[PDB]
Symmetry: D3
Subunit: 231 residues, 6 copies
């Protein structure tokens, strides 16, 4: 595989997908037993290890549809990965999305052309794998972790003169990130399972920041939910 | 309201949405107590009645994004309707979608331009209200009704020289109907709740028909699921 | 035929196409001899009968490109229908379109994606069959019925936050309805003949309503023109 | 006016619009009394003269939407031109369009982006002014000149690897030229009157050429029809 | 060749491409030895002659993507033309583009659909042939003629209610003309060499005109640069 | 600045832009004096150091329009960067592009929607800053490094079922990468200077790989050209 320097078997059925390869390192080393690094290519670290005696891998994706598509493609095609879970965050675009909320994306809107390229006059709506979604949801409820289930917006431009998120907020969209559409689309295409779990980095519309302590907590809940949504 | 001849209060918080106004009549009269017809405009019958002592209405929608949008718009704007549930069927486009399956749409793809008109370079992904979805799902599981959760395709043309459903099947899309995108989009826009529950009228790709008896059963399960997903 | 429960021969060469299936019933029973109903499917009534000893049928279409396309498709493919005439109304978008005017559409603009789906980078301009147009025009002139000949706009959304009709008015477009583009496109594709004849339900831009009496008259003139444009 | 070197009044209410400025010269000098040339700018000759004691002008347009738009724009804006009549030819794309036929375009399809630029998600259908159309039609019938009334295709590329005219033929489109959409669109926008009258230069699909003698005749009929459609 | 009445060999490897066929005549007769006119078709004059003992031709193109595409297509396909150089002018859309500047276009933006037709979801960026570009640049520098190298905008509409040139100026685009995209695209497609050299007819945004004397000079420099960029 | 943890002044006027943050480290440490790392955020290392007594920085960009846009945006907005030079490689899509060639992109095509989002019906052609281009070209020629000047294709999908590069090759496009369009577009928008210099990682169409030794050499020439194109 071109972008991942690993061997047959070095990668688990379940990969967790942060955007930052340093959060990849942090996650593995903080949460997992007998950790191994399998990829050092391009600094986009991946790691396999164990959680409750079950194998789990953690691969960085980079930022943007185009970067994540690369990793998801190779993970699926070259390493027969079965379940794929994005664990990152997003800018919240609604007031009712609270900074302690954990978002489970049923679907994703986008200004990426990726789907228009393949489909033309169809708006393809990507779709989370429901069984993973239900699991993650259950895992949250049973521990009373605050959870919201709805849609997000996979953007191409972080800095965006022509942002239409105001209109997206008005249609119930929860927050904007930059990966989900690609994950959900590529996974479904290959008959695989995928889900994005997200925390709120800030409220983008009402301006305000969230604190370091608030981020640590919700981060930690995201990884918890992800892990138990699986074991 | 232009298309519905009813009075303030004559319509419930929860409306069920068949496409056929004669299935609207059938549903109400078969399932509901002390039934009343409130709309005779254009033959697109609507009915309010009672189920387990709780008010429920049933309004026909017509076929197509443009027709349902009319009814959904008026129901929401003129009659402050809170929950909206499409109960119809669809052509299945995958082999693994069985003729006894009951489909709960998390989202919908489309070749309707309705969203491109409002959004331009965004693929808007419509999103089912999750709380209704979960309810309907639970209601099925607890009675052991076979249920599938995924996406569908809201088409504009029934007869379609340029059908791309083959490609849609390959991405996990379950079946094609002609209403969901509109329901989900208009509902979310108005901060309301919506869901499409669907049965399989036929397999469109593998050609074969389903029998009258198979349709009666699954139909009956759809209305059951809808009702209990609410009470 | 899937949507029409009729037998070979039960449907005439010339079908008149109201949107409302109750105007279908009204028209037939008010204007035609030895009337027969051939379709009760979905409440979308169709009727064959006689006018001046010549067979004429009247089929409801529903509202929207997607609904009418269904009926037009089946009428053409399953019942070898030769001439198709939409008789409905429209919202007028110009001041010079008077509430007593009868509109004959030479062509139609649209925000439906139906043609973009089939054609891509082509703006397909649908085209009325001229021989029917000329007839209808003659039939009006010879009785001195006020008649206007120009274009309309086939819309997808009745209620439309992103309405561009102001700009359409400025280019001479007369009024907005929701069926013509589909009729004209499907008819021409099958080497058949089609025409939309329309009355003014209201002025949409200058706001004002038209009265019940004004509508009865112009309605009656529309059906007159349609019938004589044929006999 | 930038592209036309003429003075207030030097140009008539009725301008005839060939594409070739040498057919402009030919037309005027062959058909008109006391001829005057008013424009020599860019070689795109225009001429005013008299026909049956009534003033008529004849201005070359060039080939393509972009060129004709220039001349039509200036003629309308700078010289208050009221009626505009394209007299050129086209490649026929249907077998039933005979080489002696004279085409009156009710409307025009296009791959020009001109309308998509102004309108976005609307397919704008340009529309001939009916009163001119009727006149031209009458003028043909009364002299028994063979005449067809339908649509054409305004193309951007003469030589076209991606030609979709095969599909356009199947929808009843008669022939392809390169000016009409622009004429009809700009004229209607300015509350003016326009019409394209066309002869068949060749059959494009069935390959075959038409002879010099056949072209002279039909040409001559086109100019005849145009003139009498006015006097 | 359909649009050019010339014989095998009558046209040089290097053709200069003004838009005006009268500037074509002027150029040849002012700059070239033993001049011959080979095309009189449609008034779009072409001329072959000699400059410093080397053959050079000069063909008018008309205005617009669609017109120039015709001439470029035939010149390339029918007369095996190798180098093609547009010598015209443009409206400047930036303050820093001075009225004495000579523009060499590396590339061109457009609202023509020509490339979208062939490519769909790709923005094709046309590309000047660099060897010609470098030559022309050198030829300017060595004589100290003021020269700017950047991009332009090939527009379809001269008069443009929906002009986006303000936004184009902000991205460094230098000026607007109506031919370059077509030249560069068709030339590259046929493995040929092309370049647009342009003078400033006016500043379009800041309104002001340039004088007749300023135009004569820069014109003369354009033709100079073109010729020496070749000998 | 959100994505780069550096202080005012820590970053030079001239930044070199590899995609791989490990090639960023390699480049700096191999080519530059008194090297300093200023960014460790996300593993996307940036470094400032000295070359021939002049300050030069080297920042990784990630893969894809969306990732590079982030870094370019911050570098320009937060650190007033003046010149930006992408030094990476690309898949060659033409036979005449030799594995030892060094590509200087005058412009870039794309299937990214980034520009369509901002521009709509315009194909925006991004444009390299010519002064940097000329420098880099000169620097190559004077040392006799093999250099090609033309266009490339900025793709969104590395793995691409719907690849149109075959058609792009036919129009002279040299190779496909994933960053240039974004660089050139964002740089020009902010009145800055940018250039992509590229080596050939493989021939994508004719299949064959290039060797490790061939890559080391051309890589080394790319960095050489970049540096001297500046000093
Ligand atoms: N567009 C956008 N992306 C965001 C935002 N906050 C975050 Br964390 N992201 C994510 O973080 C990366 C860029 O910061 C991308 O992967 C996004 O998924 C935001 O406020 N806006
Ligand atoms: N496009 C499409 N629509 C279908 C199909 N089967 C059914 Br029931 N429908 C639904 O039935 C109506 C038309 O028959 C529309 O509302 C659709 O929701 C099908 O096989 N294809
Ligand atoms: N969009 C639109 N459609 C209209 C209007 N008035 C009428 Br009657 N219609 C027609 O009536 C149906 C919806 O009311 C559609 O079939 C349209 O053809 C109007 O003011 N606007
Ligand atoms: N695209 C196209 N245009 C044609 C054709 N025949 C003729 Br005459 N034209 C017209 O002639 C000019 C180019 O030859 C354009 O103005 C068109 O209006 C044809 O076969 N194809
Ligand atoms: N759109 C546009 N085209 C221009 C302008 N100035 C000139 Br000279 N042109 C060129 O001149 C012709 C129309 O006047 C076209 O070929 C353009 O190349 C201008 O200010 N705007
Ligand atoms: N699409 C594409 N990108 C390529 C290729 N070879 C290379 Br190195 N790249 C570049 O390398 C990264 C992905 O491998 C992207 O940044 C591209 O710029 C190729 O053959 N195809």
């Amino acid at each position: 595989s071109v972008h991942i320097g690993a061997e047959k078997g070095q990668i688990a059925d379940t990969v967790l997908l942060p955007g930052d390869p340093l959060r990849a390192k942090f996650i593995a080393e903080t949460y997992l037993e007998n950790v191994e690094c399998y990829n050092e290519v391009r600094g986009m670290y991946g790691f396999t290890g164990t959680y409750k005696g079950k194998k789990i891998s953690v691969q960085g994706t980079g930022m943007g549809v185009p970067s994540i598509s690369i990793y998801v493609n190779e993970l699926i095609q070259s390493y027969d990965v079965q379940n794929l879970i994005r664990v990152g965050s997003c800018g919240a675009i609604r007031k009712d999305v609270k900074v302690r909320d954990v978002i489970l994306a049923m679907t994703s809107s986008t200004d990426s052309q990726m789907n228009r390229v393949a489909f033309g006059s169809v708006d393809f709506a990507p779709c989370a794998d429901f069984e993973l979604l239900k699991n993650a949801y259950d895992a949250a409820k049973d521990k009373g972790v605050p959870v919201t289930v709805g849609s997000v917006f996979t953007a191409d431009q972080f800095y965006n003169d022509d942002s239409q998120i105001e209109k997206l907020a008005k249609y119930g969209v929860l927050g904007v990130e930059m990966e989900t559409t690609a994950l959900y689309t590529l996974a479904a295409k290959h008959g695989r399972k995928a889900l994005s779990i997200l925390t709120v980095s800030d409220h983008v519309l009402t301006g305000e920041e969230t604190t370091a302590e608030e981020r640590q907590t919700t981060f930690h809940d995201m990884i918890d939910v992800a892990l138990h949504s699986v074991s």
